[PDB]
Design a protein around this ligand. Structure first.
Ligand SMILES: Nc1ncnc2c1ncn2[C@@H]1O[C@H](COP(=O)(O)OP(=O)(O)OP(=O)(O)O)[C@@H](O)[C@H]1O
Ligand SMILES: Nc1ncnc2c1ncn2[C@@H]1O[C@H](COP(=O)(O)OP(=O)(O)OP(=O)(O)O)[C@@H](O)[C@H]1O
Ligand SMILES: Nc1ncnc2c1ncn2[C@@H]1O[C@H](COP(=O)(O)OP(=O)(O)OP(=O)(O)O)[C@@H](O)[C@H]1O
Ligand SMILES: [Mg+2]
Ligand SMILES: [Mg+2]
Ligand SMILES: [Mg+2]
Lengths: 523, 523, 523
């Protein structure tokens, strides 16, 4: 029908305003200062967002345009957030600065394309500089500091991350679970995780993450792939004479062969999940066996000649809970048998030694390793359930950031890298003036987040920024110290990856926002 | 869509106003003074709330924001109320004071985080002080006084609690039932209670408590777990040739194995409940046997080879009523056989003696103890049914508070502990000024409820508070006396646990309220 | 009309907003930077206004409350403006800062009285510091600079002031007149000034100043006081033939008798003025003689026996123009008799030497001095009449400021004194915290105007202010230099008096605003 059109600046402004609103909350929240943000929920009690990210999520704009603009930033921010594990706010902050400048440039009427290109070019240059700048991660104490950064002055999270990290080992994966109680618990977990996808997003559970968690799942393992429903059905009868979420492991499902019959034919009332059996070939079988032992269930294979129909519920193992993500499917804890698990591990271990070949050894060793799992679980307590969820999310983000940060090594925090790079970046020129301005804009954007921290300090960011820029090498401002010192010496370092990730995303967002001169909507 | 946003103070104010409104009623009601509050009900006759708590429940705010804010307080208050058994109002009162100050501080613009931390710190300090301050509970006369406090000058409740408590014994559990008639009846009850959960909240009955009560329940006991519906079904046929609520006892239900078939397949028209059979192993069987005798029903086990299908309704016992809560499932009174029950008890008792081992003795002794139950039931009469319900609720709260109070021992009432602690607390300083103010705020919050009582007195709380603070040791004001005397000497003591519980919750609430600077809602 | 009564912040808020609006324009204009302001006109092209004072004058607020608030500032500012001659804006700027803070404090709910007291206390302290800080005025080159400051980068004004000042002498009074033409004209004017009041404000001329200027005045001098009209009348009759405006000098004119008859009876179509003859006794006569010679008119005394009636117009002298103010009455230029005037001066001069006594010498010397000194007049040209008026006003202000500045000596400009004093002030504490905050507020207020200049520079005032504060001695920022240097060395100095005056007034204004708890207005 009729469209309400806003031209250029008009289109931009809606996004910009939305961006600003979202950004403002985020910026203040970013850094230790932001205590909290809260807003209502349509259903249920209103959500409260401790984190900057959560704030962005929480914040919705009444205006469609503004909201959409806000959403765009958030979505990018989240993506950066996931990968980096941290720097969600930073990306948002960066984006806002870039966007605003871009918009102004838009006001200038310089073709945004050059600017975008310039920005991208600047980003690339900055990235390169950052990479060189970045240095190896410091020790666990640093790690805690890294954790704290993700923490946003959540001391506990950093401590937990460090503590979990120490026990597990940096290499060892750490998993987070909701705390049993207010006090956190760190437990080594028994179980194995195998990287398998979820066959269909349909399987994908309710939660936003889309990882599916089953409570007291039942595990049916078949070495053979599950061709059709019918074979499955007798299992199902045991299972629809069941209910708490059944997990099914099949070597393969033809999303052709299984899916049509299963979905239509099968009520699927009981929760069901399907995963491909880990590994392939004998190894796959071996993995299945390992899983089966861990589950405590039994596996049925054609070679065995056991029938799925014949197999009862008992054959199916149970898990305390299972979490599945597209990348990987894990069982938090199979009931298993303590002896059984150990025995299998030993047997596999013996096998590992036994096999002459490295390859054989590797498969076995991998298998054994999985069984122990080396997994650590972290529980987060909270005053309230809501808090716990919030805390947990923060913790998870921190963990990812920390892990990434350590491997990458950590660049000086405080946006020191960003400021430092920008200066170098400034010298570089874009192909054309429009590009040049964009490049400058990007540089400006980088500078801003340093200022924001300063603003939180209440110190005038101009002086700090100037001083920071002036200092060669790694120079930065420590909010807590409110003294000038080497970032490395300070030991507060922001992860290279997180910084890089955030910057890239922010730049991308900004460019996108910049590009759309005009927006059209239905009236 | 578009959102209506209130920033910071705007967000807070809605909550604050709501809090104040709710709080005001609660505060006045708190203490003997508050005669009553009443408001309409959407359906049915409007509820009338004698109690402060009920007032809060009753009071709803038209404004969503205000209402939500009010709700938040109430929910916390209720939680405190449950645990403490008393002090529901106190928590509310405390919260309001804290919130208001926090809001003002919010107006100050000091970061609430520090304040919250300070408040928490203050709370912790106060708690420690309180614990030291607290002293052992006094005698039953004191108990009645304790009861009266929960009573809010409900003399009857305190008397009933004391009376019930005396007969049952403090240790012995006391249960409350609606009064048969206006006159209360205290009867020792025959029956056993076993701690078992309800399999599903679905089972959970209509009432808010969620405890499920069945009228004239039928009890089917199986030693063996009920794997599937089908085995159940023939029982059901007897029971679908039935209607008034069937209770089912199964050793285990796979919420996998039973649930899918039962729910979908089974109409479940007749009320059904499921509980796991108490105990495990032989003891579980023994417990089942004890239950079976008490029920007067019979239990069927595979070992017996009796069939569930074979078993008739007659095999199933009947109970006058059953109440189930997640923690525990109890049968108020199985029809049982008087002789049978006694005989079983004796047999078990003999067994207890017979067993050499302590362990064997313990299991038997526990079993025997349950059968007698040592249970006492209290009936509350009322002029009207509504009143009775109100009274009953109050009675229950009092009982919990009293029981907790006795074990803990009772601290001086009148908020004496609170005032006393605060002074000590005041000396302690928070890490930072913002924290400091919050700490002070908390202290102020503690003081307030003393004032409220004074206000009810009409005496100027300032003088009283000052005097109370001035007095060392336990110093307090007795409203009734309107004379200064030792709280202990007065013998009016508020339970340590209740006070502690309320304070902690109130603090938590306040912090939460404080945190949310701004609230966003859809327009 | 009706009355609307309000109490509370709301009254304040209106004032604050009004203040800000006026202040903002003024602040930007203040310092060389403020380009301009414009006004509308009902008829003709809209007027355009210049300097900040003019800006403030031009600015009116639609809202009564806001307007009134704005007005209050302006009135005080003008008063300061008059006395200082400069610093109108500064006072306004200071006031705004103070007011806002005070208002915030009002928001705080601290009792403003303490704050006002604290502010006053701070002001006093600051004043003392300033006085000590102040140093003697520099030479004419400095004077021009002083002029420029009043100039607000009006080079011409400063030059004119300096030029006029040089010729006249600093001590010598300089008068400003509208320029004959675009080019300014500086003419020294012969004449004597004697401090005499205007008998009645009725006499007071049209212009706002109320000083009365007569064009080609005729001077009638009577040694005797002019008791009544009748004696005057025959002079007047000649005056009728006259009509060049008549000035009357009488020893004393009783207001009632003369004025009543004169005003009512006499149309007074020709302007008439009356002044008391300068001096008393013989000296008065002598002064009269001196005046008479300077006028070139003759004086009639009873002792002489000359009759006023007898005296013709010729006896009355003429002046090119006369200006009268309440404090003093001056004749810009009597036509005089060249020979007569000179001879008398010589005679007086001889007398001065001649007189043995100091007293005689003093009177004579004073008499000669008045004639000798003469007066200097400055004409200001303009592109347009409107401009000229504006320029003239600015010039006048500058002149006053310069004159004051020179005598006082000039303190470092740039608000350096203000910033410097504040630091010292900060140490001083008010009696009570509320006072303390007010004191701090005042200090903050002082700092602000430095910032404003910086802001105009575009440099971040924070750094500058910090730097300025840090420097001991006279440290300041020169806008033009944009380099740090000694203010004195720079030679840019703001007059002590002007600074002091502005500060005091501003403080007074701020204090006043804070109070006024209740306001009543028409509905
Ligand atoms: N306690 C602290 N002391 C000093 N600097 C800190 C502290 N906490 C964080 N920082 C700095 O502030 C920035 C990190 O804050 P934050 O983690 O909020 O930003 P973010 O990661 O972008 O936001 P989010 O964590 O919500 O994704 C970094 O530059 C970091 O070095
Ligand atoms: N009859 C009484 N005489 C003296 N003081 C009393 C009396 N009844 C109560 N109090 C005091 O008043 C406070 C208890 O009142 P109340 O029980 O209403 O508060 P509450 O427990 O917080 O509210 P609710 O009982 O609704 O949860 C205590 O400090 C108690 O010592
Ligand atoms: N050309 C200039 N270069 C450097 N500083 C200047 C210059 N002109 C003025 N200043 C400084 O700026 C301030 C004076 O500006 P201005 O005269 O506008 O303020 P004001 O006297 O308060 O306003 P008004 O002149 O309208 O009363 C002083 O501190 C003065 O030293
Ligand atoms: Mg972070
Ligand atoms: Mg109570
Ligand atoms: Mg000036």
């Amino acid at each position: 029908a009729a469209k309400d059109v806003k031209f250029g600046n008009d289109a931009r402004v809606k996004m910009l305003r939305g961006v600003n609103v979202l950004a403002d909350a985020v910026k203040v929240t970013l850094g230790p200062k932001g205590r909290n943000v809260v807003l209502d929920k349509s259903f249920g009690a209103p959500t409260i967002t401790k984190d900057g990210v959560s704030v962005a999520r929480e914040i919705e704009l009444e205006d469609k345009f503004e909201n959409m603009g806000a959403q765009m930033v958030k979505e990018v921010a989240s993506k950066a957030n996931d990968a980096a594990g941290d720097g969600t706010t930073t990306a948002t902050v960066l984006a806002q600065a870039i966007i605003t400048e871009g918009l102004k440039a838009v006001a200038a009427g310089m073709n945004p394309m050059d600017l975008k290109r310039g920005i991208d070019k600047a980003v690339t240059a900055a990235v390169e500089e950052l990479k060189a700048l970045s240095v190896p991660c410091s020790d666990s104490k640093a790690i805690a500091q890294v954790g704290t950064i993700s923490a946003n002055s959540d001391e506990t999270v950093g401590k937990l991350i460090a503590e979990a990290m120490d026990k597990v080992g940096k290499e060892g994966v750490i998993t987070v679970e909701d705390g049993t109680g207010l006090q956190d618990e760190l437990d080594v977990v028994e179980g194995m995780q195998f990287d398998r996808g979820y066959l269909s997003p349909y399987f994908i559970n309710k939660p936003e993450t889309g990882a599916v968690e089953l409570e007291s799942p039942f595990i049916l393992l078949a070495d053979k792939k599950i061709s059709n429903i019918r074979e499955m059905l007798p299992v199902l009868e045991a299972v629809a004479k069941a209910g708490k979420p059944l997990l099914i492991i099949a070597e393969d499902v033809e999303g052709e062969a299984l899916a049509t019959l299963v979905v239509n034919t099968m009520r699927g009332i009981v929760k069901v999940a399907a995963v491909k059996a880990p590994g392939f070939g004998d190894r796959r079988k071996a993995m299945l066996q390992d899983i089966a032992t861990l589950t405590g269930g039994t596996v049925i294979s054609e070679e065995i000649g056991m029938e799925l129909e014949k197999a009862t519920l008992e054959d199916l193992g149970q898990a305390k809970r299972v979490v599945i993500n597209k990348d990987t499917t894990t069982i938090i804890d199979g009931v298993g048998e303590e002896a059984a698990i150990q025995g299998r591990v030993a047997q596999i271990r013996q096998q590992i030694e036994e096999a002459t070949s490295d390859y054989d050894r590797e498969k076995l060793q991998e298998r054994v390793a999985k069984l122990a799992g080396g997994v650590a679980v972290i529980k987060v307590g909270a005053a309230t359930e809501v808090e716990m969820k919030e805390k947990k999310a923060r913790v998870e983000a921190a963990l990812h950031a920390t892990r990434a940060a350590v491997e990458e090594g950590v660049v000086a925090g405080g946006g020191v890298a960003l400021i430092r790079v920008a200066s170098k970046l400034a010298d570089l020129r874009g192909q054309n003036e429009d590009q040049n301005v964009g490049i400058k804009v990007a540089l400006r954007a980088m500078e801003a987040p340093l200022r924001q921290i300063v603003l939180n300090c209440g110190e005038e960011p101009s002086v700090v920024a100037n001083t920071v820029k002036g200092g060669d090498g790694n120079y930065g401002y420590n909010a807590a110290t409110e003294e000038y010192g080497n970032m490395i010496d300070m030991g507060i370092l922001d992860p290279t990856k997180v910084t890089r990730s955030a910057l890239q995303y922010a730049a991308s967002v900004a460019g996108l926002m910049i590009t759309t001169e005009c927006m059209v909507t239905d009236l």
